[PDB]
Amino acid sequence: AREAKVLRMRFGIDMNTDYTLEEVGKQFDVTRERIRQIEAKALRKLRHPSRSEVLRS
Amino acid sequence: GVLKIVKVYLAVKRRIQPGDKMAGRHGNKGVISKINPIEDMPYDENGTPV
Amino acid sequence: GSVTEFLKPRLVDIEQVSSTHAKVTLEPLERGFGHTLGNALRRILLSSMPGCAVTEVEIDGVLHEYSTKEGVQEDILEILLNLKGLAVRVQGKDEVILTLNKSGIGPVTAADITHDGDVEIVKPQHVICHLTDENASISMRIKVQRGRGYVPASTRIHSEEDERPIGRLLVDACYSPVERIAYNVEAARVEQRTDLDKLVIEMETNGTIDPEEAIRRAATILAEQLEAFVDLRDVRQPEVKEEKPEFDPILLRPVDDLELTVRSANCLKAEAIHYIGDLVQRTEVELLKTPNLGKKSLTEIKDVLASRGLSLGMRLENWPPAS
Amino acid sequence: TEFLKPRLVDIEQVSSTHAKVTLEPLERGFGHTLGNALRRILLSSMPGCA
Amino acid sequence: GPEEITADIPNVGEAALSKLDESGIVYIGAEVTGGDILVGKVTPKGETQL
């Protein structure tokens, strides 16, 4: 949840208006760098699945 | 229109595919069917097939 | 087992009229078999025969087959068409590169080809070119291969030579050495019984094969094919291929797909790194200790890997399943 | 380099006498060659008492 | 904006330079098939929103 919501809210998907590191860092106490860390960690998670890989092209 | 254009002349070579409209000279229309190997075509007393 | 009578066929006199035309007679034959073996041998001879043929031709100063050359009365297409009917008999190889250099006024035949010790040329009088001016010269590389049953250049779209230079001109292949095949039954005057025939097989080839190995290879194919007509286990195929890739299919592609510098490509080819499945799980620690691999090459690798989404020096202890 | 062997083989006996046999993997003309060959053997070259 | 003929076509692989030169035009004498590129050309278009 503290990673799906992060990626979802940052890049703004399934919620219309997308927010920035501050507006997400305030609603999750820890500001900026912390949320960017998790934001990068999720991207780290997406290096094995092929679904989005082939959807890329 | 505008700007530069490029023409590329490429040449292809087609064989007699099954379906080509091929005809004689006496209104002898025809369309090729199959391909049929030489090994199973009508021959005579000699090796000469058709 | 103890039944039947039957007889056996045997080779008699092989009358060699010419270098191309030939006659193979089989005398010890009954009535039914003499006419039965006729079509079997005829078909397998008119198709499923070996022989060598030209596949690729590289001419100096010529890019495509629709071009011309100074001092050459014939165009490139006609030259290729002449190389089609090149009677070649290779000793013990599956691919040979015949070089052909010739200059000055006069016709260039198959004799002007560098006489190889393995290559036996039937007709060295075969017309290939016709140089006009005395200052004209040609030098082409011909490739001959062993095959069976036609198979032109259209068949191989690009399933051979990933690069293949511009000069290489693909030529269609006429593998079968046999031009025509005829046969007559005829009553046999076998000084023995009275009701026997002698399968006379009239043959016409190009001289790149002898009736001996010709008929024997033919009957050999017939025997090997009739082999499956003995037992009939009705063996089926298991099929059921697995439909669940455990990892990303891209890791199955070689490092060539990375599209990087030549130096880095040679380093990976020297470090025994063929597929990207090995480069993706190799750390910078191991990459630094690689011969001729510096900051530029290392940056090159991380860039071409990160751009494809993948990373460097990961771990996926599942390599490789599972055939 | 050489040739291939027929792999998929099916046999259905529409009784003890009538039967059908199918062999799929075969090259050009071979089906007809073996067909005529086996036919000319089965229609005369067979023993049996009558 | 204007449309330029380049070899820097987005979303391409090694098949690009394989047939095409440093400019973006196929070499005279190259063998091409259905799908290959003959002249590399790109058109300007921002926005897209994504």
Swiss-Prot record, chain A:
Give the recorded effect for A1D. Disrupts the interaction with Escherichia phage lambda antitermination protein Q
Looking at the record, which segments are called Sigma-70 factor domain-4? Answer: 1-48
The entry's DNA-binding region feature spans: 21-40
Q: What is the effect of changing R44 to D/E?
A: 2-fold reduction in activation of class II Crp-dependent promoters
Please give the subunit comment from the record: Interacts transiently with the RNA polymerase catalytic core formed by RpoA, RpoB, RpoC and RpoZ (2 alpha, 1 beta, 1 beta' and 1 omega subunit) to form the RNA polymerase holoenzyme that can initiate transcription. Identified in a complex containing RpoD, the RNA polymerase subunits RpoA, RpoB and RpoZ, CRP and DNA. Interacts with Rsd; this prevents interaction with the RNA polymerase catalytic core and with promoter DNA, and as a consequence, promotes transcription from promoters that require alternative sigma factors.
Domain description: Contains 4 domains, connected by flexible linkers. In the active conformation, the domains are in an extended conformation, each making extensive interactions with the RNA polymerase catalytic core. In the autoinhibited state, sigma-70 factor domain-1 packs closely together with sigma-70 factor domains-2 and -4, contrary to the extended conformation that is seen when the protein is part of the RNA polymerase holoenzyme.
- Recorded protein name is RNA polymerase sigma factor RpoD
User: Which stretch of the intact protein is present?
Assistant: 553 to 609 of 613
Swiss-Prot record, chain D:
Post-translational modification, as annotated: (Microbial infection) ADP-ribosylated on both alpha subunits by the phage T4 protein ModA. ADP-ribosylated on only one of the alpha subunits by the phage T4 protein Alt.
Q: Record's superkingdom?
A: Bacteria
Q: What's the family? A: Belongs to the RNA polymerase alpha chain family.
Summarize the protein's role. DNA-dependent RNA polymerase (RNAP) catalyzes the transcription of DNA into RNA using the four ribonucleoside triphosphates as substrates. This subunit plays an important role in subunit assembly since its dimerization is the first step in the sequential assembly of subunits to form the holoenzyme. Part of the processive rRNA transcription and antitermination complex (rrnTAC). The complex forms an RNA-chaperone ring around the RNA exit tunnel of RNAP. It supports rapid transcription and antitermination of rRNA operons, cotranscriptional rRNA folding, and annealing of distal rRNA regions to allow correct ribosome biogenesis.
Quote the entry's note on domains: The N-terminal domain is essential for RNAP assembly and basal transcription, whereas the C-terminal domain is involved in interaction with transcriptional regulators (such as CRP) and with upstream promoter elements.
Listed under subunit, the entry gives: Homodimer. The RNAP catalytic core consists of 2 alpha, 1 beta, 1 beta' and 1 omega subunit. When a sigma factor is associated with the core the holoenzyme is formed, which can initiate transcription. Both the N- and C-terminus interact with different regions of transcriptional regulator CRP. The rRNA transcription and antitermination complex (rrnTAC) consists of RNAP, NusA, NusB, NusE (rpsJ), NusG, SubB, ribosomal protein S4, DNA and precursor rRNA; S4 is more flexible than other subunits.
Task: Identify this protein by name.
Answer: DNA-directed RNA polymerase subunit alpha
Which organism is this protein's natural source? Answer: Escherichia coli (strain K12)
UniProtKB/Swiss-Prot annotation, chain E:
Highest taxon of source: Bacteria
PTM summary from the entry reads:
Acetylated on several lysine residues in the presence of glucose.
Its biotech or industrial use comes down to: Co-administration of salinamide and rifampicin or salinamide and myxopyronin suppresses the emergence of resistance to both antibiotics.
Q: Which residues cross the membrane?
A: none
Its annotated function is as follows:
DNA-dependent RNA polymerase (RNAP) catalyzes the transcription of DNA into RNA using the four ribonucleoside triphosphates as substrates. Resistance to the antibiotics salinamide A, salinamide B, rifampicin, streptolydigin, CBR703, myxopyronin, and lipiarmycin can result from mutations in this protein.
Which family does the entry's similarity section mention?
Belongs to the RNA polymerase beta chain family.
Q: Summarize subunit and interaction data from the UniProt record for this chain.
A: The RNAP catalytic core consists of 2 alpha, 1 beta, 1 beta' and 1 omega subunit. When a sigma factor is associated with the core the holoenzyme is formed, which can initiate transcription. The rRNA transcription and antitermination complex (rrnTAC) consists of RNAP, NusA, NusB, NusE (rpsJ), NusG, SubB, ribosomal protein S4, DNA and precursor rRNA; S4 is more flexible than other subunits. In pull-down experiments interacts with CedA.
Please identify the protein, giving its name as recorded: DNA-directed RNA polymerase subunit beta
Gene it is expressed from: rpoB
Q: Which region of the full protein is contained in this chain?
A: 846 to 895 of 1342
